[PDB]
A paper describes a structure:
Here we present two crystal structures of LaIHA, one bound to the hydrolytic product isatinate, and one bound to benzyl benzoate, as well as the apo structure of homologous RsIHA. Together with results from enzyme kinetic analysis, the resolved structures are used to describe the molecular basis for the Mn2+-dependent mechanism of hydrolysis, showing that [name] is a true orthologue of IHB. The highly conserved Mn2+ binding site is located at the bottom of the substrate-binding pocket.
The structures of LaIHA:benzyl benzoate and LaIHA:isatinate were determined at 1.50 Å and 1.79 Å resolution, respectively, while the one of RsIHA was determined at 2.65 Å resolution. The more distant homolog from [name] (RsIHA) shares 59% SI with LaIHA and 51% SI with LaIHB. Unlike the whole sequence, the active site and substrate binding pocket are highly conserved among these proteins. Even though the key substrate binding pocket residues originally identified in the structure of LaIHB - Phe63, Trp65 and Trp84 and Phe20917 do not share equivalent positions in the sequences of LaIHA or RsIHA, their aromatic side chains do adopt an identical structural conformation in the respective binding pockets, thus indicating functional conservation. Compared to LaIHB, the Mn2+ binding sites in both RsIHA and LaIHA include Gln219, also responsible for increased metal specificity. Structural superposition revealed identical metal binding sites in the two homologues. Activity measurements confirm that both LaIHA and RsIHA have [name] activity. The determination of the catalytic parameters assuming Michaelis-Menten kinetics yields Km values for LaIHA and RsIHA of 16 μM and 10 μM, respectively. The enzyme kinetics analyses, accompanying structural determination of LaIHA and RsIHA, present striking evidence that RsIHA, LaIHA, and LaIHB are true orthologues enzymes.
Numbering used by the authors:
A (entry chain A): -1 to 263
B (entry chain B): 4 to 263
The structure:
Amino acid sequence: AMATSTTPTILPALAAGLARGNIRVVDLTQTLSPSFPTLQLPSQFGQVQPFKIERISHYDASGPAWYWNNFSCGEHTGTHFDAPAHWITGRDYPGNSVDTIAPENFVAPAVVIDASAQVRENEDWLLTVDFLQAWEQRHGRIPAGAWVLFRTDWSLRVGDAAAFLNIREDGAHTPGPTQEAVEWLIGERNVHGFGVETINTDAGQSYAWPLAYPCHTLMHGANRYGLQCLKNLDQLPPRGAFILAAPLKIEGGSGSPLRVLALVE
Amino acid sequence: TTPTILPALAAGLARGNIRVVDLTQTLSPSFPTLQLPSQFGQVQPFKIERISHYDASGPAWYWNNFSCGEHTGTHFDAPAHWITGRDYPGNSVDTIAPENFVAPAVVIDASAQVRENEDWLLTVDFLQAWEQRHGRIPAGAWVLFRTDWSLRVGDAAAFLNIREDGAHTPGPTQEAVEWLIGERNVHGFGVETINTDAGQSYAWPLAYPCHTLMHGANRYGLQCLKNLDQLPPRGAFILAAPLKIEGGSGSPLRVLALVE
Ligand SMILES: [Mn+2]
Ligand SMILES: [Mn+2]
């Protein structure tokens, strides 16, 4: 529902659409809580803090008319955003941290790739170029400047931290893209970024590939972005959704937790 | 079926017809921290520590840990934050209907007045005069109070502006708050200061009318905004989604504004 000029303004129409219910708002964010799975690296590396929250007052002696908390966590805690500075191949880009990235990049279209049935039968399942090209045969070309949201239904494991991280003696076993798929998405489709439901955009076992963690290496290496621990991807269409993903303005931040929202029309 | 608005929005952003404005202050240890009388619980200042920096602690990556409060820097005030809004359903940042995280805004410029009086008060007459000039304030819209107070951010003492008789920062009167809520049905109130209420309103017989009445009416607040000088009087669209902190009374957030 828009105006009657050849090239009108969109924001009035947008506001009215959201109010009417023509455009819905979907929450793709997990809840920040002390029970949320915390990533653990081998002991030789520095570790991220888990989410901790402590009450300051609760309408009581400490604060008779108000209630509020202090909290602590890591940049890469829960539903969060990966800036290019996070990886060594993206260290030297000008606007590569969450406080310097051009604000325009915090809003973008998205496509959703559903592989939940495949991951249900293989926790190490790999997203391939062949699979992506078959997707386009059904839903059309992946548009340049769009998020690629990898739906795996992995978010349903959030109640079980052991199941969510899914770690064995040889590391984490989680699904992810092949190097060729990452190269194709960047070079042939010029995507905005890569979004997952897991605690890693890369496949867990890709630490041992010739080029370790290809998604982190190549996406950040090409000044692109990442999203992690997304949920409710099953409520999104294959294409047409619009993502609101603005990270905290942390000085020199390599990433931050954020409230990821999807607009659906 | 066939969408019409969202493709136009994406296209407009890509072509440059629609601009994105960052209304957010940078989170850093040097940013002014809210301070209360010593008998009350205090909010933690923003601190940050490196985990690794492409070194032995993490050969190919860089990342930090950090700690702060829900009410640090540019942040979002939820109705559960105040005792009058504690009983509303969906009153915390994890339970508020997500539809409330996007809303239009009006921008009321009082920079000229505040520059001559640090304790300047937003009154009903000023708002009604504003409407005669820029139209009626629409229901469900943010009321963004421009004071250019954000320019004081480099000086913590000047930003908080506390003297022996409390803080001296601009804000609305009780009548103004009641009017905006009861007669216009606004979405919430947003300011460039660390307080949506006037600093001296702590001593008013009805202390902190904005916090008390706005949250008491299941409405919201934004603190420590900036770049309000780049927004039109009306027509701006605000993106303000708070962190999904479990039972959170608020959170820091990235506040954006779409302008065309
Ligand atoms: Mn991350
Ligand atoms: Mn606050």
